[PDB]
Tab-separated table of C-alpha atoms in Angstrom:
chain	number	residue	atom	x	y	z
A	1	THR	CA	127.512	126.130	100.534
A	2	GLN	CA	124.126	124.694	99.503
A	3	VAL	CA	122.301	122.862	102.316
A	4	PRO	CA	119.967	120.150	100.949
A	5	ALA	CA	116.348	121.166	101.581
A	6	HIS	CA	114.926	117.640	102.140
A	7	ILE	CA	117.016	114.830	103.724
A	8	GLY	CA	115.805	111.231	103.950
A	9	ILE	CA	117.335	109.140	106.740
A	10	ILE	CA	117.207	105.379	107.275
A	11	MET	CA	118.077	105.093	110.966
A	12	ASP	CA	119.949	101.783	111.033
A	13	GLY	CA	122.251	100.239	113.672
A	14	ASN	CA	120.459	100.622	117.036
A	15	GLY	CA	120.727	96.892	117.804
A	16	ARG	CA	124.413	96.604	116.876
A	17	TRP	CA	125.187	99.775	118.891
A	18	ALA	CA	123.545	98.337	122.021
A	19	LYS	CA	125.322	94.966	121.540
A	20	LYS	CA	128.661	96.794	121.143
A	21	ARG	CA	127.967	98.518	124.523
A	22	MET	CA	126.816	95.208	126.118
A	23	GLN	CA	123.294	96.540	126.773
A	24	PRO	CA	119.809	95.289	125.746
A	25	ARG	CA	118.507	96.249	122.264
A	26	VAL	CA	115.973	98.560	124.038
A	27	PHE	CA	118.847	100.858	125.148
A	28	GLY	CA	119.838	101.270	121.485
A	29	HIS	CA	116.398	102.501	120.389
A	30	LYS	CA	116.431	104.927	123.345
A	31	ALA	CA	119.836	106.264	122.219
A	32	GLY	CA	118.451	106.330	118.658
A	33	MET	CA	115.768	108.736	119.943
A	34	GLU	CA	118.539	110.941	121.412
A	35	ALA	CA	120.436	110.895	118.100
A	36	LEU	CA	117.259	111.973	116.266
A	37	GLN	CA	116.732	114.850	118.746
A	38	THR	CA	120.322	116.049	118.157
A	39	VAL	CA	120.132	115.653	114.356
A	40	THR	CA	116.681	117.309	114.126
A	41	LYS	CA	117.840	120.403	116.112
A	42	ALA	CA	121.095	120.714	114.151
A	43	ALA	CA	119.421	120.410	110.733
A	44	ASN	CA	116.768	122.985	111.726
A	45	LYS	CA	119.505	125.500	112.659
A	46	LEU	CA	121.491	124.772	109.461
A	47	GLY	CA	118.363	125.535	107.348
A	48	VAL	CA	117.142	122.074	106.281
A	49	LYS	CA	113.430	122.308	105.434
A	50	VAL	CA	112.462	118.618	105.780
A	51	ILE	CA	113.777	115.427	107.373
A	52	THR	CA	111.913	112.205	106.578
A	53	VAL	CA	113.091	109.457	108.943
A	54	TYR	CA	112.550	105.699	108.713
A	55	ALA	CA	112.911	103.213	111.585
A	56	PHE	CA	114.713	100.224	109.972
A	57	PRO	CA	110.860	90.706	118.494
A	58	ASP	CA	107.616	89.993	120.451
A	59	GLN	CA	108.549	91.941	123.609
A	60	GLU	CA	110.747	94.254	121.460
A	61	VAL	CA	107.759	95.629	119.462
A	62	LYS	CA	105.986	96.429	122.786
A	63	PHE	CA	108.961	98.613	123.800
A	64	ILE	CA	109.191	100.090	120.256
A	65	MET	CA	105.465	101.041	120.062
A	66	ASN	CA	105.911	102.766	123.467
A	67	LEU	CA	108.689	105.000	121.960
A	68	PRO	CA	106.253	107.460	120.269
A	69	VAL	CA	104.630	107.894	123.712
A	70	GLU	CA	108.118	108.431	125.186
A	71	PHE	CA	108.935	110.768	122.263
A	72	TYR	CA	105.838	112.851	123.026
A	73	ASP	CA	106.596	113.145	126.771
A	74	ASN	CA	110.395	113.738	126.847
A	75	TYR	CA	111.413	115.056	123.372
A	76	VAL	CA	108.477	116.742	121.543
A	77	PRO	CA	108.279	119.777	123.887
A	78	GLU	CA	111.911	120.718	123.139
A	79	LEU	CA	111.386	120.213	119.386
A	80	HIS	CA	108.247	122.378	119.612
A	81	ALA	CA	110.343	125.068	121.375
A	82	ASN	CA	112.781	124.823	118.408
A	83	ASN	CA	109.913	125.625	115.966
A	84	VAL	CA	109.907	122.083	114.477
A	85	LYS	CA	106.738	120.847	112.759
A	86	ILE	CA	106.038	117.129	113.297
A	87	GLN	CA	104.209	115.043	110.681
A	88	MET	CA	103.920	111.316	109.938
A	89	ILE	CA	103.587	109.265	106.748
A	90	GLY	CA	102.553	105.630	106.266
A	91	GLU	CA	99.629	103.381	107.188
A	92	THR	CA	99.056	104.891	110.621
A	93	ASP	CA	95.659	103.127	111.082
A	94	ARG	CA	97.527	99.904	111.950
A	95	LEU	CA	99.214	101.574	114.954
A	96	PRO	CA	97.942	101.035	118.553
A	97	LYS	CA	95.559	103.533	120.190
A	98	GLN	CA	98.178	104.966	122.595
A	99	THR	CA	100.749	105.283	119.790
A	100	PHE	CA	98.440	107.008	117.275
A	101	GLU	CA	97.154	109.375	119.999
A	102	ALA	CA	100.692	110.393	121.142
A	103	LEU	CA	101.657	111.080	117.519
A	104	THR	CA	98.403	113.005	116.880
A	105	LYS	CA	99.063	115.225	119.933
A	106	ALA	CA	102.591	115.853	118.568
A	107	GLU	CA	101.059	116.864	115.194
A	108	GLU	CA	98.472	119.137	116.838
A	109	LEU	CA	101.041	120.720	119.199
A	110	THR	CA	103.436	121.607	116.383
A	111	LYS	CA	101.034	122.313	113.444
A	112	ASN	CA	101.577	126.102	113.430
A	113	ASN	CA	105.389	125.773	113.466
A	114	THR	CA	107.318	127.355	110.594
A	115	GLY	CA	110.773	125.709	110.922
A	116	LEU	CA	112.036	122.275	109.863
A	117	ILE	CA	109.420	119.572	109.181
A	118	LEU	CA	110.224	116.288	110.957
A	119	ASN	CA	108.430	113.630	108.962
A	120	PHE	CA	108.095	110.230	110.685
A	121	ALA	CA	107.782	107.277	108.308
A	122	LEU	CA	105.856	104.805	110.484
A	123	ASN	CA	104.357	101.523	109.325
A	124	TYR	CA	105.616	102.774	105.973
A	125	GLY	CA	106.389	100.873	102.750
A	126	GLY	CA	107.213	102.476	99.383
A	127	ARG	CA	105.377	99.948	97.221
A	128	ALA	CA	102.355	100.082	99.548
A	129	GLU	CA	102.340	103.904	99.352
A	130	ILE	CA	102.391	103.699	95.539
A	131	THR	CA	99.784	100.883	95.551
A	132	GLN	CA	97.254	102.861	97.593
A	133	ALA	CA	97.888	105.960	95.417
A	134	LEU	CA	97.201	103.921	92.258
A	135	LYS	CA	94.031	102.578	93.980
A	136	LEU	CA	92.537	105.963	94.963
A	137	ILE	CA	93.256	107.423	91.494
A	138	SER	CA	91.499	104.435	89.846
A	139	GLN	CA	88.499	104.934	92.176
A	140	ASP	CA	88.293	108.636	91.241
A	141	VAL	CA	88.500	107.693	87.526
A	142	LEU	CA	85.647	105.174	88.036
A	143	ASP	CA	83.617	107.964	89.753
A	144	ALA	CA	84.343	110.433	86.865
A	145	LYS	CA	86.133	113.018	89.081
A	146	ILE	CA	89.327	112.571	87.024
A	147	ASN	CA	89.846	111.367	83.431
A	148	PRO	CA	92.321	108.615	82.425
A	149	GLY	CA	93.965	111.284	80.205
A	150	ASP	CA	94.751	113.322	83.369
A	151	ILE	CA	96.961	110.520	84.834
A	152	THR	CA	100.498	111.948	85.111
A	153	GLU	CA	103.556	111.763	87.386
A	154	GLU	CA	102.370	115.002	89.058
A	155	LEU	CA	98.960	113.463	89.801
A	156	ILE	CA	100.556	110.356	91.360
A	157	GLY	CA	102.735	112.678	93.474
A	158	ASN	CA	99.588	114.356	94.848
A	159	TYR	CA	98.216	110.953	96.051
A	160	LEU	CA	101.386	109.721	97.850
A	161	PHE	CA	101.768	110.114	101.643
A	162	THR	CA	104.283	112.942	101.044
A	163	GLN	CA	101.434	115.052	99.475
A	164	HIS	CA	101.075	117.117	102.700
A	165	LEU	CA	104.633	118.476	102.382
A	166	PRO	CA	105.050	121.694	100.331
A	167	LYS	CA	105.164	120.891	96.599
A	168	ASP	CA	108.834	121.891	96.035
A	169	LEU	CA	110.034	119.863	99.090
A	170	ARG	CA	108.290	116.487	98.536
A	171	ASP	CA	111.333	114.681	97.101
A	172	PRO	CA	114.525	114.158	99.138
A	173	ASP	CA	117.660	115.813	97.759
A	174	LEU	CA	119.792	113.494	99.897
A	175	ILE	CA	119.103	110.053	101.403
A	176	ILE	CA	121.415	108.982	104.243
A	177	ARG	CA	121.709	105.351	105.288
A	178	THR	CA	123.630	104.357	108.423
A	179	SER	CA	125.201	101.101	109.717
A	180	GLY	CA	127.053	100.185	106.477
A	181	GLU	CA	124.110	98.721	104.519
A	182	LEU	CA	124.297	99.480	100.780
A	183	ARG	CA	120.636	98.789	99.924
A	184	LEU	CA	117.266	100.486	99.383
A	185	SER	CA	114.751	98.929	101.878
A	186	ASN	CA	111.591	100.263	100.169
A	187	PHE	CA	112.103	103.829	101.463
A	188	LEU	CA	110.676	106.568	99.204
A	189	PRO	CA	111.225	104.695	95.889
A	190	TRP	CA	109.148	107.252	93.940
A	191	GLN	CA	110.154	110.445	95.740
A	192	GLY	CA	113.824	109.401	96.021
A	193	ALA	CA	114.230	108.326	92.353
A	194	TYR	CA	116.844	111.055	91.598
A	195	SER	CA	118.249	111.571	95.110
A	196	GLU	CA	121.901	111.682	96.013
A	197	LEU	CA	122.654	108.661	98.186
A	198	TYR	CA	125.123	108.775	101.073
A	199	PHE	CA	126.231	105.678	103.000
A	200	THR	CA	128.148	105.598	106.289
A	201	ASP	CA	129.373	102.843	108.590
A	202	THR	CA	128.517	104.901	111.697
A	203	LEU	CA	125.626	103.419	113.693
A	204	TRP	CA	122.492	105.580	114.042
A	205	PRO	CA	122.850	106.353	117.795
A	206	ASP	CA	126.402	107.694	117.049
A	207	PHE	CA	125.079	109.827	114.147
A	208	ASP	CA	125.359	113.373	115.562
A	209	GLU	CA	125.726	116.968	114.269
A	210	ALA	CA	129.286	116.278	113.022
A	211	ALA	CA	128.081	113.205	111.076
A	212	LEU	CA	125.266	115.348	109.596
A	213	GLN	CA	127.744	118.061	108.526
A	214	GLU	CA	129.990	115.423	106.907
A	215	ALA	CA	126.979	114.090	104.947
A	216	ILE	CA	126.010	117.637	103.888
A	217	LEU	CA	129.669	118.226	102.910
A	218	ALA	CA	129.658	115.065	100.753
A	219	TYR	CA	126.416	116.235	99.067
A	220	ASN	CA	128.000	119.586	98.035
A	221	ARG	CA	131.073	117.869	96.545
A	222	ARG	CA	128.768	115.894	94.167
A	223	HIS	CA	127.823	118.964	92.101
B	1	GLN	CA	125.900	81.989	95.077
B	2	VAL	CA	125.040	84.076	91.972
B	3	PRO	CA	122.369	86.838	91.903
B	4	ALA	CA	119.579	85.878	89.480
B	5	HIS	CA	118.735	89.415	88.273
B	6	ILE	CA	121.365	92.186	88.030
B	7	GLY	CA	120.470	95.791	87.132
B	8	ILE	CA	123.278	97.825	85.514
B	9	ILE	CA	123.427	101.596	84.995
B	10	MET	CA	125.999	101.984	82.213
B	11	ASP	CA	127.581	105.393	82.914
B	12	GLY	CA	130.945	106.908	81.917
B	13	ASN	CA	131.129	106.378	78.126
B	14	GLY	CA	131.682	110.104	77.462
B	15	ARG	CA	134.298	110.458	80.226
B	16	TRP	CA	136.094	107.361	78.862
B	17	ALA	CA	136.329	108.857	75.346
B	18	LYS	CA	137.391	112.345	76.534
B	19	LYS	CA	140.151	110.793	78.712
B	20	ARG	CA	141.673	109.237	75.543
B	21	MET	CA	141.392	112.479	73.457
B	22	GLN	CA	138.843	110.715	71.193
B	23	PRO	CA	135.309	111.714	70.093
B	24	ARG	CA	132.231	110.768	72.182
B	25	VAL	CA	131.134	108.200	69.538
B	26	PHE	CA	134.296	106.155	70.274
B	27	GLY	CA	133.188	105.827	73.924
B	28	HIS	CA	129.767	104.396	73.043
B	29	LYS	CA	131.251	101.748	70.700
B	30	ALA	CA	133.545	100.718	73.583
B	31	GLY	CA	130.393	100.662	75.759
B	32	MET	CA	128.760	98.111	73.413
B	33	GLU	CA	131.919	95.927	73.655
B	34	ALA	CA	131.696	96.120	77.458
B	35	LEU	CA	128.027	95.068	77.284
B	36	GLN	CA	128.901	92.123	75.020
B	37	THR	CA	131.647	90.981	77.428
B	38	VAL	CA	129.371	91.389	80.483
B	39	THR	CA	126.362	89.718	78.799
B	40	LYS	CA	128.421	86.641	77.745
B	41	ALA	CA	130.158	86.352	81.137
B	42	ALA	CA	126.921	86.761	83.136
B	43	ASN	CA	125.267	84.076	80.959
B	44	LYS	CA	128.240	81.765	81.635
B	45	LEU	CA	128.081	82.317	85.422
B	46	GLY	CA	124.339	81.439	85.535
B	47	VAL	CA	122.741	84.899	85.852
B	48	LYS	CA	119.112	84.719	84.648
B	49	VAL	CA	118.387	88.405	83.892
B	50	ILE	CA	120.379	91.576	83.301
B	51	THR	CA	118.549	94.861	82.882
B	52	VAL	CA	120.829	97.510	81.376
B	53	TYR	CA	120.256	101.264	81.381
B	54	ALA	CA	122.262	103.660	79.198
B	55	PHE	CA	122.431	106.890	81.242
B	56	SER	CA	124.790	109.892	81.641
B	57	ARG	CA	124.015	118.790	75.439
B	58	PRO	CA	121.009	116.431	75.990
B	59	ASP	CA	120.154	116.339	72.241
B	60	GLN	CA	123.535	114.628	71.657
B	61	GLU	CA	122.946	112.025	74.398
B	62	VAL	CA	119.520	111.080	72.952
B	63	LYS	CA	121.072	110.350	69.516
B	64	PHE	CA	123.586	107.862	70.990
B	65	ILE	CA	120.988	105.979	73.067
B	66	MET	CA	118.704	105.660	70.003
B	67	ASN	CA	121.609	104.678	67.696
B	68	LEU	CA	122.560	101.841	70.132
B	69	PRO	CA	120.106	99.048	69.079
B	70	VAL	CA	120.770	99.562	65.332
B	71	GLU	CA	124.550	99.111	65.738
B	72	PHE	CA	124.092	96.421	68.424
B	73	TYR	CA	121.932	94.338	66.053
B	74	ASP	CA	124.490	94.446	63.222
B	75	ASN	CA	127.692	93.956	65.217
B	76	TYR	CA	126.766	92.031	68.417
B	77	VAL	CA	123.314	90.331	68.469
B	78	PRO	CA	124.256	87.364	66.198
B	79	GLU	CA	126.926	86.287	68.725
B	80	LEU	CA	124.400	86.687	71.594
B	81	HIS	CA	121.893	84.545	69.664
B	82	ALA	CA	124.608	81.863	69.220
B	83	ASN	CA	125.167	82.012	73.017
B	84	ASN	CA	121.429	81.314	73.683
B	85	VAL	CA	120.787	84.834	75.084
B	86	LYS	CA	117.234	86.224	74.915
B	87	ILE	CA	116.972	89.948	74.070
B	88	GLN	CA	114.063	92.116	75.299
B	89	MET	CA	113.368	95.857	75.548
B	90	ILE	CA	111.650	97.825	78.323
B	91	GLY	CA	110.557	101.462	77.978
B	92	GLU	CA	108.270	103.500	75.723
B	93	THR	CA	108.201	102.310	72.083
B	94	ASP	CA	105.694	104.843	70.639
B	95	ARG	CA	108.278	107.670	70.487
B	96	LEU	CA	111.102	105.618	68.853
B	97	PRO	CA	112.568	106.267	65.365
B	98	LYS	CA	111.679	103.781	62.579
B	99	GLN	CA	115.164	102.230	62.159
B	100	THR	CA	115.506	101.786	65.940
B	101	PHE	CA	112.106	100.110	66.454
B	102	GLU	CA	112.859	97.705	63.579
B	103	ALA	CA	116.316	96.845	65.019
B	104	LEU	CA	114.879	96.138	68.503
B	105	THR	CA	112.001	94.010	67.174
B	106	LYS	CA	114.361	92.044	64.878
B	107	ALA	CA	116.615	91.434	67.911
B	108	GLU	CA	113.590	90.293	69.966
B	109	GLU	CA	112.055	88.089	67.241
B	110	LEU	CA	115.446	86.449	66.550
B	111	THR	CA	116.096	85.524	70.184
B	112	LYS	CA	112.546	84.915	71.553
B	113	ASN	CA	112.882	81.112	71.910
B	114	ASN	CA	116.281	81.271	73.664
B	115	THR	CA	116.428	79.735	77.146
B	116	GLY	CA	119.648	81.296	78.531
B	117	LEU	CA	120.206	84.750	80.076
B	118	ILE	CA	117.567	87.418	79.362
B	119	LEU	CA	119.288	90.660	78.264
B	120	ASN	CA	116.758	93.390	79.090
B	121	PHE	CA	117.486	96.759	77.405
B	122	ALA	CA	116.060	99.795	79.209
B	123	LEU	CA	115.730	102.374	76.405
B	124	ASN	CA	113.546	105.488	76.498
B	125	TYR	CA	112.916	104.304	80.053
B	126	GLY	CA	111.915	106.136	83.216
B	127	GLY	CA	110.706	104.473	86.430
B	128	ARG	CA	108.089	107.067	87.329
B	129	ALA	CA	106.907	107.032	83.699
B	130	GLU	CA	106.704	103.201	83.800
B	131	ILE	CA	104.576	103.327	86.972
B	132	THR	CA	102.410	106.089	85.438
B	133	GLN	CA	101.869	104.056	82.238
B	134	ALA	CA	100.954	101.055	84.423
B	135	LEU	CA	98.281	103.146	86.163
B	136	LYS	CA	96.831	104.281	82.792
B	137	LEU	CA	96.361	100.626	81.787
B	138	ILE	CA	94.989	99.661	85.242
B	139	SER	CA	92.641	102.701	85.231
B	140	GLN	CA	91.338	101.723	81.764
B	141	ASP	CA	90.772	98.105	82.925
B	142	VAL	CA	88.729	99.503	85.870
B	143	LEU	CA	86.533	101.475	83.399
B	144	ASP	CA	86.193	98.381	81.157
B	145	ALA	CA	85.150	96.376	84.290
B	146	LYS	CA	87.892	93.732	83.891
B	147	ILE	CA	88.982	94.507	87.477
B	148	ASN	CA	87.804	96.293	90.629
B	149	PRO	CA	89.824	99.037	92.382
B	150	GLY	CA	89.829	96.585	95.353
B	151	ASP	CA	91.829	94.142	93.188
B	152	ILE	CA	94.688	96.716	92.902
B	153	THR	CA	97.491	95.248	95.034
B	154	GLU	CA	101.306	95.174	94.853
B	155	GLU	CA	101.172	91.878	92.930
B	156	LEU	CA	98.720	93.318	90.360
B	157	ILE	CA	100.884	96.399	89.739
B	158	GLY	CA	103.852	94.075	89.051
B	159	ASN	CA	101.871	92.471	86.198
B	160	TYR	CA	101.375	95.925	84.531
B	161	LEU	CA	104.997	97.215	84.720
B	162	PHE	CA	107.413	96.828	81.766
B	163	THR	CA	109.112	93.935	83.608
B	164	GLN	CA	105.848	91.870	83.472
B	165	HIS	CA	107.257	89.843	80.534
B	166	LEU	CA	110.017	88.463	82.807
B	167	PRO	CA	109.123	85.349	84.873
B	168	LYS	CA	107.415	86.204	88.170
B	169	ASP	CA	110.294	85.103	90.475
B	170	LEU	CA	112.906	87.062	88.435
B	171	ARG	CA	111.158	90.454	87.902
B	172	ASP	CA	113.014	92.309	90.700
B	173	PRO	CA	116.804	92.887	90.598
B	174	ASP	CA	118.749	91.330	93.475
B	175	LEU	CA	121.688	93.618	92.725
B	176	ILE	CA	121.926	97.008	91.000
B	177	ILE	CA	125.345	98.142	89.727
B	178	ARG	CA	126.254	101.720	88.841
B	179	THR	CA	129.512	102.741	87.159
B	180	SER	CA	131.340	106.098	86.879
B	181	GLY	CA	131.339	106.956	90.611
B	182	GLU	CA	127.851	108.513	90.801
B	183	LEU	CA	125.818	107.620	93.905
B	184	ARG	CA	122.318	107.925	92.399
B	185	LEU	CA	119.718	105.564	90.889
B	186	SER	CA	118.523	108.081	88.241
B	187	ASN	CA	114.945	106.794	88.134
B	188	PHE	CA	115.982	103.183	87.354
B	189	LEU	CA	113.570	100.407	88.438
B	190	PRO	CA	112.304	102.358	91.503
B	191	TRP	CA	109.524	99.816	92.210
B	192	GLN	CA	111.359	96.640	91.170
B	193	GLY	CA	114.655	97.611	92.806
B	194	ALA	CA	113.041	98.644	96.145
B	195	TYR	CA	114.871	95.931	98.161
B	196	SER	CA	117.985	95.556	95.951
B	197	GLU	CA	121.591	95.450	97.079
B	198	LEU	CA	123.534	98.367	95.577
B	199	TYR	CA	127.076	98.360	94.188
B	200	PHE	CA	128.850	101.596	93.237
B	201	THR	CA	132.224	101.667	91.448
B	202	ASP	CA	134.362	104.545	90.137
B	203	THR	CA	135.208	102.373	87.086
B	204	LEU	CA	133.907	103.805	83.782
B	205	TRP	CA	131.468	101.537	81.873
B	206	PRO	CA	133.795	100.703	78.915
B	207	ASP	CA	136.348	99.308	81.444
B	208	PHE	CA	133.660	97.213	83.198
B	209	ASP	CA	134.403	93.599	82.237
B	210	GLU	CA	133.971	90.007	83.506
B	211	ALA	CA	136.448	90.736	86.341
B	212	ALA	CA	134.513	93.805	87.514
B	213	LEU	CA	131.279	91.778	87.242
B	214	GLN	CA	132.785	89.105	89.542
B	215	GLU	CA	134.031	91.757	92.022
B	216	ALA	CA	130.414	93.020	92.119
B	217	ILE	CA	129.039	89.474	92.662
B	218	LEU	CA	131.676	88.981	95.405
B	219	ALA	CA	130.505	92.149	97.213
B	220	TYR	CA	126.879	90.926	96.940
B	221	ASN	CA	127.809	87.591	98.595
B	222	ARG	CA	129.601	89.375	101.491
B	223	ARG	CA	126.219	91.004	102.386
B	224	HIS	CA	124.848	87.577	103.400
């Protein structure tokens, strides 16, 4: 049937997964990377146009900010060979030098690719995305580039971080949340306003191609 | 352990009426009874705010949503006033009919001093539209030099949304309920609900009562 063109995913449950396997939380994030690799390849083959993914303590953040570097070295080449285009959204200026540079190389490597767009939401917050959009628009109105009569929902959409996606694919058709949490977490509040929501108890590192197909199957049974 | 602000998407009125071989109008009158029951019960339990959204031949659906506050004023608001419930509307007023605008304002003016539960009606409401209208007002205040673009923060935007009239600690729903089995938010409080707990039930809105409200509050407490 109809495959949803844009899927949002809140990758929850890496810590619980690792605890369940009696391993450090760091092992869970590593397995979370594997799950993303599997899901990204499967969705690309099934014909999904976009996946926007969202990751959810002192020494943990050091290991977590090294994951984009690890992503670039051990996963990005295979994704690039699968014709996957890699982008990021969020306040990426806050990220460390090594992290921003690994992600930039992944963007540059894959920028000509014509398959699925893998969109990393990093240092991302919905309200903050909207806030900065409403700031830039107000600056442009103060500088007379745009009129206050030109302020519309379409204009706001052009100033969000999802602006770089193709116009018809900016808004998720489906938002998947793992690990049993029935809540929003400030992920794509604007873009996801009309999205089908799907909730599963399965933990993110166990979310595989079969779990993706079950989510896509649930989406088709809606309408 | 009661959530202070509960959002409610009231869906399933049409399905409820068609199941009983009755006209669609019958379903919406039963929907107003459900709202009365839920409003009274929530007020009793100590809920501070409920924001309600009537959502579901689109020309037919618009007539029922706009007829709501006229009938609600005549048949239900007096009892809510006696129960110390404050009534407020969020959404766009400019495009309302005359009889509807008068019925909403009479309901507001009647109940404006009440110190119990705030019943917040979302009528002619859209989240994206609300945020867009907030920008228009912020943009105009930047041109008038009342504020700088640098002053535009998350807290400022909150003061320009339709929920600004609620107290600052109660503006955002802690829980959002949707009836009729649909797993969507349908453009309801996208900003304000960004961190809300969600509760979905297959129950149709006219069957949603005090008991269903308490089952929802129970589920909310199991999250903590």
